[PDB]
Amino acid sequence: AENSVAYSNNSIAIPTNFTISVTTEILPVSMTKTSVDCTMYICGDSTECS
């Protein structure tokens, strides 16, 4: 939305009331831990491929 602050060199704007806002912030920390095997993934139950 277009706004225009009414600026002049003798006028100020002071709040007379307030509000208390509780906002939410979501942050990732860790991810899934995985582990791999060579022979079970690549060949798998194969002696000559191992």
């Binding site: 582990s35 095997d37 022979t39 079970m40 798998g44 139950d45």
Partner: protein
């Protein structure tokens, strides 16, 4: 090969896995369904000082 309980359709012969690998078979003499599992897992963890 292990005894299984999968509900194969009468025209179906093999069952396929997520990796499109053969997971279940049908024995051509006795029409039963057998699951295929790996031999043995090799990765064990060793906790030592």
């Amino acid at each position: 090969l292990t005894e299984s309980n999968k509900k194969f359709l009468p025209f179906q012969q093999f069952g396929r896995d997520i990796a499109d690998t053969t997971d279940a078979v049908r024995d051509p003499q006795t029409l039963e369904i057998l699951d295929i599992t790996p031999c043995s897992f090799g990765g064990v963890s060793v906790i030592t000082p």
